[PDB]
Amino acid sequence: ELVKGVYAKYWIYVCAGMFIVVSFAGRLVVYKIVYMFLFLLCLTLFQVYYSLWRKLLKAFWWLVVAYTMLVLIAVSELFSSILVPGFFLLACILQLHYFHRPFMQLTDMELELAAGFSDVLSRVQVFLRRLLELHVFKLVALYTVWVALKEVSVMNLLLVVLWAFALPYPRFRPMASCLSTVWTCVIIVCKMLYQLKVVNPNWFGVRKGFPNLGYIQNHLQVLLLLVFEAIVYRRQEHYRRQHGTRQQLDQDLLGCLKYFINFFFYKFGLEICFLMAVNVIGQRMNFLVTLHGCWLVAILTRRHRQAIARLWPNYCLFLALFLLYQYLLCLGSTNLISDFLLLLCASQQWQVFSAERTYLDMLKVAVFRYLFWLVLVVVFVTGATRISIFGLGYLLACFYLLLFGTALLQRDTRARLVLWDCLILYNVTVIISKNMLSAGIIWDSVCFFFLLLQRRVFLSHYYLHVRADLQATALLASRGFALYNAANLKSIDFHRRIEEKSLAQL
Amino acid sequence: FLWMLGQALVDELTRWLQEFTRHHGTMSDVLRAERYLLTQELLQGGEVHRGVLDQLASELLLDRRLRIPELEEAELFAEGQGRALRLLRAVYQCVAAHSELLCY
């Protein structure tokens, strides 16, 4: 019964795949297109009403045999159109009566090294489920955008609207999924009923194409993503239905690793939404990309995290109304995906902004002490690899900050930070201007990262300790001089003695 | 075997470098111990007096008998590091000792 149980969990999809095969067996006439509609109906109900889908599971596959029967009976060429429906019904039969009920039971949530491997594999499986439970609205939303950014129309436009007004406001996520599934299927059906013989000679999406699978493959994979997401949700639900803290950071290396896999976008999030806006104005360089520039330099200027958290409501609305308007002006368009990657990142920082309201020792020294010095080398190589006028500015800022650097690493935060913030504004101005007047932005983006990382080191609590050390050395300098001078005088005397001994002997 | 033979020579070099930086090392340790206490007072929010140092180059190491905790355990970690890490420490020590000859 091992294989019977394998079939009672991982083989119902063979029937579903076969549905498609029948529908796409050569020239699709009405009946083959209705075959597709039936496949679609099954998968659509799975999402909409899981309970009801389960209720009409094998009943629908029995209706499947029903359809296939009539076809083959009425309709070598003709025999190949009988063969495939026969194959389809055969697969159904096996699940239908022999594995359908134990499957309704699998879905009922209401040697030596082989054992070692099994345990290792078990750990992996559990972990990967957790990750894909939370990081899946991302891939769904991204794929439905890549599809509707390539096939610009007025029937795939609604899909952009759905996954671009449900990413900022994340209460709509369930209804987004629902309406996408139905609509993607409307698209699939219409485009198929356009590959008919009475449908002959685009803005509205529907067009003709000789490879029928290749044509309706894109929108089919979207239906797939959507449904796969629901499977993962319920599978993980079943697992637990049946069957990395702050402290850890300051213990071992693995402790810290865990803290960051858990929370990275929790902490370093304002920084990553700003490094995504720099990407838009570096891959597009048009005129509608200059307003992304002005938002960066009006959000960055309010230097307090709390003040920025009051403008995020508008940053997120703007980025969503700009993707739609730029795609209305692309219908009457594959670089507008950078305006998406950023409506995603920023909708996620709006979440942190309302949820915060609710040998390792060796590494910490080389990040909180000898990093200011590496930022300063990058400033030089940002401005001496790209020979221009802006590049000279970087060279000359390195020179200033190397000379008056020791004093900066010691001053109270107020100032420490003023200087850094100023250096950040030269970067942003350069980035926003190289655009208005058009060698590129890559090296000014490595730099914008480093300088935003050091603003965080200079505002930590672990830097307070390095400030202490540096302050102390300035006080104990006098002692140092004395120690050195004493040592010098001692050696002088020893040498002088030796010379006098020689002169006595002589 | 050659890898292990090479490791023996690495240790020989490390020994030489440690002798080349000996005087600097001693001066540093006197000042590190002094800094340990100095920072404590600063962190308290109090003044750094002469008494702080009184609680505690080669001569001053011997005279001082206030054995500090953290600094000693740190030295053990250093001794118990891999040969690679220790060889690189030796190189940094040499550069930071004779910096003039580098500039030149």
Coordinates of C-alpha atoms in Angstrom, one line a residue, chain B residues 1-96:
Chain B
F1 CA 54.2 16.0 4.5
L2 CA 55.3 19.1 2.7
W3 CA 52.3 21.1 4.1
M4 CA 53.3 20.2 7.6
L5 CA 57.0 20.9 6.9
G6 CA 56.0 24.3 5.5
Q7 CA 54.0 25.0 8.7
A8 CA 57.1 24.4 10.7
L9 CA 59.0 27.1 8.7
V10 CA 56.0 29.4 9.1
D11 CA 56.4 29.1 12.9
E12 CA 60.1 29.9 12.6
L13 CA 59.3 33.1 10.7
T14 CA 56.7 34.0 13.2
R15 CA 59.2 33.7 16.0
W16 CA 61.7 35.9 14.2
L17 CA 59.1 38.6 13.6
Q18 CA 58.0 38.5 17.2
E19 CA 61.6 39.2 18.3
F20 CA 61.8 42.0 15.8
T21 CA 58.8 43.7 17.4
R22 CA 59.6 42.9 21.0
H23 CA 60.3 46.3 22.3
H24 CA 57.2 47.8 20.6
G25 CA 55.1 45.0 22.1
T26 CA 56.2 45.8 25.7
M27 CA 55.5 49.5 25.3
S28 CA 52.1 48.7 23.9
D29 CA 51.1 46.4 26.8
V30 CA 52.0 49.0 29.4
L31 CA 49.7 51.5 27.6
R32 CA 46.9 49.0 27.0
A33 CA 46.6 48.1 30.7
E34 CA 46.6 51.8 31.5
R35 CA 43.9 52.4 29.0
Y36 CA 41.7 49.6 30.4
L37 CA 41.4 51.4 33.7
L38 CA 41.3 54.9 32.1
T39 CA 38.2 54.0 30.1
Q40 CA 36.4 52.6 33.1
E41 CA 36.5 55.9 34.8
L42 CA 35.4 57.7 31.7
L43 CA 32.5 55.3 31.2
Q44 CA 31.5 55.9 34.8
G45 CA 31.3 59.6 34.1
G46 CA 34.0 60.5 36.6
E47 CA 37.4 62.1 36.2
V48 CA 40.6 60.3 35.2
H49 CA 43.0 61.1 38.0
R50 CA 46.6 59.9 38.6
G51 CA 45.3 57.5 41.2
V52 CA 43.7 55.5 38.4
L53 CA 47.1 54.7 37.0
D54 CA 48.6 54.3 40.5
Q55 CA 46.3 51.3 41.1
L56 CA 48.3 49.4 38.5
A57 CA 58.5 50.1 29.8
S58 CA 59.9 46.7 30.7
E59 CA 60.4 47.9 34.2
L60 CA 56.9 49.2 34.6
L61 CA 55.5 45.8 33.6
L62 CA 57.3 44.2 36.5
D63 CA 56.4 46.9 39.0
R64 CA 52.7 46.8 38.2
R65 CA 51.1 43.9 40.0
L66 CA 47.4 44.6 39.5
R67 CA 46.7 41.6 37.3
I68 CA 43.7 42.4 35.1
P69 CA 41.1 39.9 34.0
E70 CA 39.9 40.5 30.5
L71 CA 43.3 41.3 29.0
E72 CA 44.8 38.0 30.2
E73 CA 42.0 35.9 28.8
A74 CA 42.4 37.7 25.5
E75 CA 46.0 36.8 25.4
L76 CA 45.1 33.1 25.8
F77 CA 42.7 33.3 22.9
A78 CA 45.5 34.8 20.8
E79 CA 47.9 32.1 21.7
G80 CA 45.2 29.5 21.0
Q81 CA 44.6 30.7 17.5
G82 CA 45.5 28.9 14.3
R83 CA 49.0 29.3 12.9
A84 CA 47.6 31.3 9.9
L85 CA 45.9 33.8 12.1
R86 CA 49.0 34.2 14.2
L87 CA 51.3 34.6 11.3
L88 CA 49.2 37.4 10.0
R89 CA 49.2 39.0 13.4
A90 CA 52.9 38.9 13.3
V91 CA 53.0 40.7 10.0
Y92 CA 50.7 43.5 11.2
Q93 CA 52.9 43.9 14.3
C94 CA 56.0 44.3 12.2
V95 CA 54.5 47.0 10.0
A96 CA 53.0 48.9 12.9

